[PDB]
Amino acid sequence: GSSGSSGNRYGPGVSTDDITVVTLSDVPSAPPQNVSLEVVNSRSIKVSWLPPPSGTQNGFITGYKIRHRKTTRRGEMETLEPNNLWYLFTGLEKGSQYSFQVSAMTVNGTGPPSNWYTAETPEN
């Protein structure tokens, strides 16, 4: 700490300021509940589920997203049913494996999915 310094010569210095995304979202911050699987028949399966708690979801749940997967080359399929909180998939095969997933949907958009629950059909 003393008085003794010598300024330096001129120097360059870039400058810029871009705009960042500051949009607000009303999407949920938690997966659905009561997400289980139950094989009714060899080529039939009923998937049930329920909406999130009255604390995470902001918008009044409008519907739900459903995505099933098949044990074969890429070729999934998305589907949603606002009617009820259950979807029965019929037309599957035997000794196969299928997976599903439920996602809460709000007035804003689709919420985060839950664990990938898998289910196998009864050989007989």
Domain-wise residue ranges, the chain: 20-124
DSSP conformational letter for 106? -
**What technique solved it?**
NMR
Class of domain 20-124: mainly beta
How many other C-beta atoms lie within 10 A of the C-beta of residue 13? 5
- Of 116, 51, 106, 117, the closest CA to residue 84 belongs to 51
Contacts of 75 (CB under 8 A, 6+ apart): none
Contact call for residues 80 and 109 (beta carbons, < 8 A): no
